[PDB]
Amino acid sequence: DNINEDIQLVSDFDVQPKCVGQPGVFHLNMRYRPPVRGARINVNLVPALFDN
Amino acid sequence: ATGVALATFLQQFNGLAVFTKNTNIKTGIIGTNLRLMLGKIRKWASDNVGVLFSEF
Amino acid sequence: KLKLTYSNRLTLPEIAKHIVSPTFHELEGRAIPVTGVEDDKEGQSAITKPFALVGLRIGDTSGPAEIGENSRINLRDDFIIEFNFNKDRYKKGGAETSLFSYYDYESIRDRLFNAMVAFAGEYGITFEFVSLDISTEGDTVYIEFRFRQNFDWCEADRESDTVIKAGSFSLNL
Amino acid sequence: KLKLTYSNRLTLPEIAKHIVSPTFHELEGRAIPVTGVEDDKEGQSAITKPFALVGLRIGDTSGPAEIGENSRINLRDDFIIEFNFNKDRYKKGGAETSLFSYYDYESIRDRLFNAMVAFAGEYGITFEFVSLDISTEGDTVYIEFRFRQNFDWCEADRESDTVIKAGSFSLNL
Amino acid sequence: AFAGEYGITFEFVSLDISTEGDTVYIEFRFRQNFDWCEADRESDTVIKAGSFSLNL
Amino acid sequence: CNKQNGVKNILITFTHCDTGEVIGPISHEQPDDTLPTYKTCAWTNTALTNGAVMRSASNATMTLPVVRDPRVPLAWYQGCAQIDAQVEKFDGTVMTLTEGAVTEPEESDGRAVTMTIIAAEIDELLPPGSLAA
Amino acid sequence: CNKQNGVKNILITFTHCDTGEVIGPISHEQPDDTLPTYKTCAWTNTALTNGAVMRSASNATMTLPVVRDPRVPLAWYQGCAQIDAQVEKFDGTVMTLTEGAVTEPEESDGRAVTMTIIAAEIDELLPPGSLAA
Amino acid sequence: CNKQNGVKNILITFTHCDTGEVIGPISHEQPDDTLPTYKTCAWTNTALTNGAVMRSASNATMTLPVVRDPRVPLAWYQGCAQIDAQVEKFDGTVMTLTEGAVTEPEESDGRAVTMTIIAAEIDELLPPGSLAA
Amino acid sequence: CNKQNGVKNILITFTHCDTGEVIGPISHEQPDDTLPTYKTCAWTNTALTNGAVMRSASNATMTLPVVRDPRVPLAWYQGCAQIDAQVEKFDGTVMTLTEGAVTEPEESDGRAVTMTIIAAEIDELLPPGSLAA
Incomplete structure (x- = not known):
């Protein structure tokens, strides 16, 4: 829907204090969404007779 | 039909900023003024000639 | 981090405070902004050495500058940094070093450029180098750098007059 | 609104009255247009401070200016706005501030440019910035601006000689 | 000779000569063109990890 | 001020063909001194002999x-x-x-x-006082 | 006078093809120094060979x-x-x-x-004293 | 920051079609003042007439x-x-x-x-605050 | 050295097609400031649509x-x-x-x-330390 929000990146160095940030950890958040496939169809069949 | 069409068209101006003392618009602002609105109304009116209006 | 008055260029005091003072410890501060290096020129020489001045040379434009018309505005500035240092005289072997002798400037140039590039990368402000000159006067040596800034300019913010909410059309005959 | 002598340019009194006086309250008026900024330097230095002068530099042409021939005519006007301000000294901590020290011009520039933009948008007259220079003299600091106007010129409103209603068409052999 | 040996070259600008009593002054003017670079620096860290929470 | 040349405002209102998003009018400023240009008449005349032209x-x-x-x-x-x-x-x-x-x-x-x-x-749209529709 | 080059007047009279409206002669002034230009002879000559131009x-x-x-x-x-x-x-x-x-x-x-x-x-139309019709 | 124009980094990651060798992202610097240029939209519009266009x-x-x-x-x-x-x-x-x-x-x-x-x-990738996907 | 641009030597060895004569390597010097140029990759890529390319x-x-x-x-x-x-x-x-x-x-x-x-x-042939064959 909006690529600029559905994926966010987080690094270990954002929160922990001075030098506590351990070397080489980064957090990734991604919002999956399955590809839609057809599932069900409703049919309304309306017969009539020749006319006019 | 003309009334409903025009009313639908004008709707897009709702909530739009306006400047009248000094017509310069700062860069990046969303807005307009009297002259621009008049011009756009004239454009829309000219478009529909022949379907609803006789040529002015 | 710091707080900048402007978003895309630095006033001379900001330079003297954040680029010159923290880089040269030899100067116990004394990075003094001034109106112009063409100065009283007497009290200028009396400041304790070493010290460095920062002063505008001329404001200028680098292209179109038509104020008011809805077009970009390209201002430009020329400011110069001038240092002042003593002279060392180590008098080796029953002989003194001459009152004039090669004085190392390359190290000063390198240090200044490195600090400038570091800051520019950190915040996104860059300078244009223009020239370098050196001269001596008895005890003191004058080293003069000329720089230049390019930046856009914008007008202050403003308040709208009103907003639309509805419209009374007539549709006469 | 105001009433302008011309429809596309401002005479120096008009600037001194409508761009300088209403913006800088520090000047209790005292935005005096003068013939030339080099004129009578003495009396020109005795007016009460602060004050600002407006004076023509020179008038020339930005293109073709052949008078009479039925082509456009372009003209230029170089004028300079020069201010005068005192120095503020506040003696913090048993130590006076030096007679020469950095003086804030950026605020003056911003205020002036904003006023010029406002007026230009309001009426439709625009200026070209040229350069800015600053220097100090004892108690007073001279901030000097240079500007330029571009405009067309037209001739006065002449009156016809007659009108046409007739025909002879003799149509000889 | 030196330039061939190490790879540094100069630009010649002009030659001027003048005399003064006993001594003669010969003044050469030269010029150098070269690139400049910034001092070396140390990385902040290295990378080895991954979380990829993969929310709904 | 029929005796000065310059641009005073520029507005733009984007629409996305595929998704149909809309971004309301936004001002803009020019990069240099060049002004826009126009060509309004929709017909094109090609030259022929004796002053005839092909209107298309x-x-x-x-x-x-x-x-x-x-x-x-x-x-x-x-x-x-x-x-x-x-x-x-x-x-x-x-x-x-x-x-x-x-x-x-x-x-x-x-x-x-x-x-x-x-x-x-x-x-x-002309200024006040036009001589034609 | 006889030995000065320049333009002195320009008049134009627009007519609208589709509606027939007319606007009487209106003066005009040039944007820069370039003067108008002209070509009055109706025919055109191509080269061929031996001076045997082709007239059209x-x-x-x-x-x-x-x-x-x-x-x-x-x-x-x-x-x-x-x-x-x-x-x-x-x-x-x-x-x-x-x-x-x-x-x-x-x-x-x-x-x-x-x-x-x-x-x-x-x-x-030439000044007085023309040597040809 | 926002109101300044220039390039700040450039990275490249060569791959060899035949051998399949790879060289990790390496920085680079420009030879002169000319900046790079782009063209991102993957379609082309031709003129046609009456405002139509051919999209390809x-x-x-x-x-x-x-x-x-x-x-x-x-x-x-x-x-x-x-x-x-x-x-x-x-x-x-x-x-x-x-x-x-x-x-x-x-x-x-x-x-x-x-x-x-x-x-x-x-x-x-735009800076923060973009108005569209 | 590593940060100076210029040419240092040029050698040439002529052979005569018709007679088979040979002239050993002979130095040479440039007429002006223009340096030589090169193109070493043998193939050529023409641009198709959608990022395909014709290789020849x-x-x-x-x-x-x-x-x-x-x-x-x-x-x-x-x-x-x-x-x-x-x-x-x-x-x-x-x-x-x-x-x-x-x-x-x-x-x-x-x-x-x-x-x-x-x-x-x-x-x-590159200076010492190449990253590829």
Whole structure:
């Protein structure tokens, strides 16, 4: 829907204090969404007779 | 039909900023003024000639 | 981090405070902004050495500058940094070093450029180098750098007059 | 609104009255247009401070200016706005501030440019910035601006000689 | 000779000569063109990890 | 002020063909001194012999250099979006265009852009006192 | 007088093809130093060999840069209107054209316009003392 | 920051079509003041008439002048290698390209090189606050 | 050294097609400031749509302006002889070419000559520490 929000990146160095940030950890958040496939169809069949 | 069409068209101006003392618009602002609105109304009116209006 | 008055260029005091003072410890501060290096020129020489001045040379434009018309505005500035240092005289072997002798400037140039590039990368402000000159006067040596800034300019913010909410059309005959 | 002598340019009194006086309250008026900024330097230095002068530099042409021939005519006007301000000294901590020290011009520039933009948008007259220079003299600091106007010129409103209603068409052999 | 040996070259600008009593002054003017670079620096860290929470 | 030349405002209102998003009118400022240009009459005359000409159908165009707005994807200024634009000069003239389409876009460097727009018709509003409809 | 080069007047009389409206002669002034140009002979000569040129039919033309009159729609200076024009030089010459048609109009920026007119004939009036009809 | 124009980083990741060797993202610096250029929208519009246009496939392109890296064979900066590149401007924009192919290379002098890259798609990352996906 | 741009040597070894004569390597010096140029990748990429490209065969080329050696016939610098060449830049690079052929020779004035050479392959030798074969 909006690529600029559905994926966010987080690094270990954002929160922990001075030098506590351990070397080489980064957090990734991604919002999956399955590809839609057809599932069900409703049919309304309306017969009539020749006319006019 | 003309009334409903025009009313639908004008709707897009709702909530739009306006400047009248000094017509310069700062860069990046969303807005307009009297002259621009008049011009756009004239454009829309000219478009529909022949379907609803006789040529002015 | 710091707080900048402007978003895309630095006033001379900001330079003297954040680029010159923290880089040269030899100067116990004394990075003094001034109106112009063409100065009283007497009290200028009396400041304790070493010290460095920062002063505008001329404001200028680098292209179109038509104020008011809805077009970009390209201002430009020329400011110069001038240092002042003593002279060392180590008098080796029953002989003194001459009152004039090669004085190392390359190290000063390198240090200044490195600090400038570091800051520019950190915040996104860059300078244009223009020239370098050196001269001596008895005890003191004058080293003069000329720089230049390019930046856009914008007008202050403003308040709208009103907003639309509805419209009374007539549709006469 | 105001009433302008011309429809596309401002005479120096008009600037001194409508761009300088209403913006800088520090000047209790005292935005005096003068013939030339080099004129009578003495009396020109005795007016009460602060004050600002407006004076023509020179008038020339930005293109073709052949008078009479039925082509456009372009003209230029170089004028300079020069201010005068005192120095503020506040003696913090048993130590006076030096007679020469950095003086804030950026605020003056911003205020002036904003006023010029406002007026230009309001009426439709625009200026070209040229350069800015600053220097100090004892108690007073001279901030000097240079500007330029571009405009067309037209001739006065002449009156016809007659009108046409007739025909002879003799149509000889 | 030196330039061939190490790879540094100069630009010649002009030659001027003048005399003064006993001594003669010969003044050469030269010029150098070269690139400049910034001092070396140390990385902040290295990378080895991954979380990829993969929310709904 | 019928005796000065310059641009006073520029507005643009993007629309996305595929998704149908809309971005309300946004001001813009020019990158250099070049002004826009126009061509309103929709017919094109080709020369023949003895003063005859071949009158044929053709588009009405506009050329419009603008500094990019830092909030809109660059792709929208090129052929990926549908455009509506206006210009107001000092002397009071106003030029209005709608349903424009960009053509043969040239490469841009990320801040300055030139757009070549064509449309079925461009409308011009004169200052007060016109001598014709 | 006899030994000065320059333009002295320019008149134009627009007619609208589709509606028949007319606007009486209106003066005009040039945007820059470039003077108009001309070609009055209707025929054209190709080379061939041994001086055996080939004569054929062509059009009288005229090139006329003029600053727009603020009261006339811009379109009328392009393919949308029929044009009549005149020029008076200082020395006394007068170039008259009628039923002109504008061709392949280049884009204009709203104040300076260049017109390429073609017509079946252009008549030149000389100062007194001409040596030919 | 926002109101300044310039390039801030450039990265490249060569891949060799035949051997399959890879060289990790290496920085680069520019030879002169010319900035890169882009063209991201993957479609092209032709004129036609009455405002219509013909819409077609086209590509996404990039132009990228960079100073050679003394450790990489010159040939790899021409049509012998597959390229992945990125650019970061001062204001925060980032332009990413992948599996580019260098096309119609022009001769080079060994230190300055210009590449014309085309790719199926180019992605733009705007600074915070964008108004569209 | 590593950060200076310039040429350091040029060698050439002429062979005569019709007679088989040979002239051992002879140094040369440039007529002006223009450096040689190169293109080493043999293939050429044309641009299709959607990022595809048509790959085909081409020739390595070199461009070499040199001041004539006063002892060699001028013809041998033009299409009458087979050429082998080398270049050594300051930083250490070395460009080697063999069995080149001269093409479409432009007129020379007897002292400064420009050669457009084409050959099957050109091999580049890098300074120490290369990242690829």
